[PDB]
């Protein structure tokens, strides 16, 4: 829950949005996004995304 930091390009992921264009549904908590799940527009993966205090 809350929204999250990429790691280094600068694409905040926000839950309640999601990334449904990319395949993550509104709703989806962060640690429920699927590991297979990658950055919209850059090339790295799900890793060491910092909560971002909304
Ligand atoms: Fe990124």
């Given at each position: 829950?809350?929204?999250?930091?990429?790691?280094?390009?600068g694409?905040?992921?926000?839950?309640?949005?999601?990334?449904?264009?990319?395949?993550?549904?509104?709703?989806?908590?962060?640690?429920?996004?699927?590991?297979?799940?990658?950055?919209?527009?850059?090339?790295?993966?799900?890793?060491?995304?910092?909560?971002?205090?909304?």
């Amino acid at each position: 829950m809350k929204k999250y930091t990429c790691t280094v390009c600068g694409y905040i992921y926000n839950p309640e949005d999601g990334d449904p264009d990319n395949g993550v549904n509104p709703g989806t908590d962060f640690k429920d996004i699927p590991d297979d799940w990658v950055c919209p527009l850059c090339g790295v993966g799900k890793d060491q995304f910092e909560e971002v205090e909304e």
